[PDB]
Amino acid sequence: YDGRTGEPIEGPIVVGQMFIMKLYHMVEDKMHARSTGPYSLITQQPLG
């Protein structure tokens, strides 16, 4: 059944228990966003 309508899904649907895992790639190591800040001394392109 759809959760939101309560109407059924027009066609049957396979379901079951699946083993599924959480990989090393979470979203902490991942999301950055720079405005302004430091800059390297010889080359003046930034760092943090």
Does 25 help bind another protein (rule: CB under 8 A)? yes
Q: How many CA atoms lie within 13 A of 6 on its CB side?
A: 0
The reply to whether 23 sits near another protein by the rule CB under 8 A is yes
- Binding residues for another protein restricted to 2-21, rule: CB under 8 A: 2-6, 9, 13, 15, 18-21
Q: Total residues contacting another protein (rule CB under 8 A)? A: 31
Which of these, 2, 4, 23, lies nearest to 13 by C-alpha position? 2
C-alpha span between 19 and 35 (Å, rounded): 41
Which positions lie near another protein, rule CB under 8 A? 1-6, 9, 13, 15, 18-31, 38-43, 47-48
